[PDB]
Ligand binder design. Structure first.
Ligand SMILES: OC[C@H]1O[C@@H](O[C@H]2[C@H](O)[C@@H](O)[C@H](O)O[C@@H]2CO)[C@H](O)[C@@H](O)[C@@H]1O
Ligand SMILES: [Ca+2]
Ligand SMILES: [Ca+2]
Ligand SMILES: [Ca+2]
Length: 701
């Protein structure tokens, strides 16, 4: 039974014997250590993993009627990854000295990491923060109650935890150098930078910014907007399923209140003001785009001589980070998590609508959801290109935030958000709303999406594909998007296949409202790269499950497509069960990208030497000059040279041997097989567990 499968997997995730959690009760990114993808080591963790943990405990708590584990997980999150410490040392010193009339100092982003550090020029004065005052008034504090995105759970980078030294799990930053800094190209550095590592007198600050004084010791946290929102989404479900401890409900509210910082342009510039390359500061809420941008970041001085702090929003918004279930939870009486601030609920209400419009606007001619938009073209408020489509005066982006790899190519970026739009369709209908613009947008988007996705889901059959990843039809032709895609298949009992990536081209038409939507005939998703990602399966199953369920609440029966989505969910669940290895539902994956452990592509500026967390001098001697075409002048070292303790990993030998014996450094190609791995990712196993659970809850009953 699906209930039983849910409980089984839940116990496999929680078991001390399996190693999904650290000795301190903190979920890791993955049981395995040698992995690199967003976190760059498997025993980092993320705010995403914490949010998934909460989701898992919500469903389990509903089944056992005991909420103690949900509460314990929230306390753990609070203790280790939210940098607010009522009691011990202040984890945001000098946040009180924040100046909401000058939230931060402008610096340009750059098209390559090679062009960093960027000058803190204050070229563009920052606009007004219009929520700081409400938050202070509501909570008696402006300490940001959001999860930092990245935690070094085993202190693998050896920075320690400056402001809470008895905690082994330490706050760490990576990404900080623009769209071309892949996970392989970032330099891990402590969130709390007392300059005891990095360059003497400078810490790591001078990799990223330059200014005319010596950088003070300082701290810097950065959230992920989909993580905190998924925490709130989990608390929404708990409350719907009977949870009602105020102490924790109110903590989710407070989290949603601070998450509003994700709705603001990076430097509080008026939305649209950079369209012609001359931005200007926002007044009131003029810098509020009402979307979740990729992050909000906050920082300040360390020590008695550094009494300042700052905030940034973000200008780039990615469809895959919007969470309109959280927005609903935070904005309506039926959602149940309205904040007590003066405009928290009403800002989230606008956001819910704006997120739904964004999905409709971005939906390709065939039904897939294109990338997003920005208020800062090239991250320096460049004029938008002639003819660029816009959404509320923000420029369309096919790969918001990151380009290596392009951030909306991964099919996971379809499943994740479409799962939540499906949830919201269900929620609206169950709350008695068949008529609002909001349910019509949600429904229209998800109905088209489900149609789209079902062409590339294969259960008990293996799709035919070419050596470049394209799906082929029965005549052997590449299928290059379009509706009614007919993929050729062979019989393959017990296998499943999902799409891996999308190649995007074209643009949506400029947004004019839902009543004028064009169907984006010049926006094309080519779906490719058949794979067996069990994380994506779990997320998809839930999208199909909630969507089916909604169609039956709406109409009394499963609609035509409701039936197909229900059957796809059930079939995926049944085949997936065979891939349980006793620890997780898993499959083997090839990682052709793992030549980037070794490639010399980690940039350091000229004249910069310092000490890495692991003790090694960086950049050190194992370097090549940076590429003049990327506009820097500095050097590259490798991922592996920067992190010498990786050579101590038990899997390191076999990876290096495989690289030696198979990768051709001249052609850039794996000739004799790419490295292969079988990974037990926390988020992925939770997406699987929760898929069995919700099928039982919504379909079995
Ligand atoms: O960065 C998004 C998401 O990536 C996850 O890893 C994916 C990766 O993007 C894809 O190209 C790869 O080959 O499949 C994996 C596994 O699902 C990663 O697990 C997440 O933390 C991350 O948020
Ligand atoms: Ca804390
Ligand atoms: Ca790059
Ligand atoms: Ca209580």
């Amino acid at each position: 039974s699906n209930k039983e499968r849910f409980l089984t997997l839940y116990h496999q995730i929680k078991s001390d014997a399996n190693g999904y959690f650290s000795p301190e009760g903190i979920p890791y990114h993955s049981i395995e250590t040698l992995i690199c993808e967003a976190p760059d080591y498997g025993h980092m963790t993320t705010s995403e993993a914490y949010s998934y943990w909460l989701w898992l405990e919500v469903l389990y708590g509903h089944y056992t009627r005991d909420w103690s584990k949900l509460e314990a997980a929230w306390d753990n999150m609070e203790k280790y990854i939210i940098p607010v410490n009522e009691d011990g040392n202040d984890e945001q010193p000098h946040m009180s000295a924040y100046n909401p009339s000058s939230p931060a100092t402008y610096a340009s982003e750059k098209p390559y990491p090679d062009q960093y550090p960027s000058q803190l020029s204050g070229a563009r004065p920052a606009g007004q923060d219009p929520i700081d005052g409400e938050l202070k008034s509501t909570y008696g504090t402006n300490e940001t109650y959001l999860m930092h995105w990245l935690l070094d759970v085993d202190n693998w980078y050896k920075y320690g935890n400056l402001l809470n030294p008895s905690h082994k799990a330490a706050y760490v930053n990576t990404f900080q150098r623009g769209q071309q800094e892949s996970v392989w190209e970032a330099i891990p550095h402590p969130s709390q930078d007392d300059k005891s590592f990095g360059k003497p007198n400078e810490g790591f600050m001078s990799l990223f910014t330059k200014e005319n004084q010596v950088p003070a010791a300082q701290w810097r946290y950065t959230n992920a907007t989909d993580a905190d929102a998924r925490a709130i989404q989990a608390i929404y479900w708990a409350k719907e399923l009977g949870y009602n401890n105020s102490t924790y409900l109110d903590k989710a509210k407070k989290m949603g209140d601070f998450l509003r910082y994700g709705m603001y342009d990076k430097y509080f510039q008026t939305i649209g003001s950079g369209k012609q390359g001359n931005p200007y500061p926002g007044n009131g809420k003029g810098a509020c785009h009402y979307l979740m941008a990729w992050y909000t970041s906050w920082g300040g001085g360390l020590g008695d001589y550094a009494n300042w702090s700052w905030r940034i929003g973000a200008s780039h918004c990615h469809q895959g980070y919007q969470n309109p279930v959280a927005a609903y939870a935070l904005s309506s009486d039926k959602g149940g998590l309205k904040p007590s601030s003066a405009t928290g609920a009403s800002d989230w209400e606008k956001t819910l609508k704006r997120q739904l419009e964004f999905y409709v606007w971005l939906q390709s001619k065939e039904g897939a959801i294109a990338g997003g938009a920005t208020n800062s073209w090239n991250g320096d408020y460049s004029a938008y290109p002639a003819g660029r489509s816009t959404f509320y005066d923000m420029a369309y982006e096919d790969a918001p935030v990151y380009h290596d790899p392009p951030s909306n190519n991964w099919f996971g970026m379809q499943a994740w958000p479409m799962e939540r739009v499906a949830e919201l369709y269900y929620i609206f209908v169950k709350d008695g709303d068949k008529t609002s613009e909001n349910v019509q947008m949600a429904k229209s988007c998800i109905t088209k999406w489900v149609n789209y996705a079902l062409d590339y889901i294969f259960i008990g059959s293996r799709p035919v594909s070419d050596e470049e990843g394209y799906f082929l039809d029965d005549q052997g032709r590449r299928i290059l998007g379009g509706t009614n895609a007919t993929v050729a298949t062979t019989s393959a009992p017990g296998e499943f296949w999902l799409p891996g990536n999308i190649a995007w081209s074209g643009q949506p038409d400029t947004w004019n409202g839902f009543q004028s939507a064009t169907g984006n005939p010049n926006l094309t998703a080519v779906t490719k790269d058949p794979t067996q990602d069990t994380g994506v399966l779990g997320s998809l199953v839930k999208a199909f499950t909630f969507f089916a369920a909604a169609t039956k609440l709406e109409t009394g029966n499963y609609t035509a497509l409701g039936v197909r989505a229900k059957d796809a969910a059930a079939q995926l669940l049944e085949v997936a069960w065979n891939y349980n290895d006793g620890v997780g539902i898993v499959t083997e994956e090839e990682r052709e990208d793992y030549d980037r452990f070794f490639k010399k592509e980690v940039y350091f500026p000229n004249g910069w030497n310092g000490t890495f967390g692991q003790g090694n001098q960086i950049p050190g001697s194992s370097t090549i000059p940076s590429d003049p075409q990327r506009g820097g002048n500095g050097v590259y070292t490798s991922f592996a040279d920067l992190r010498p303790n990786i050579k101590q990993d038990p899997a390191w030998s076999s990876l290096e041997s495989k690289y030696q014996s198979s990768f051709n450094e001249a052609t850039g190609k794996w000739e004799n097989g790419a490295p292969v791995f079988t990974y037990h990712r926390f988020w992925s196993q939770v997406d699987m567990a929760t898929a069995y659970a919700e099928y039982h809850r919504l379909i079995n009953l």
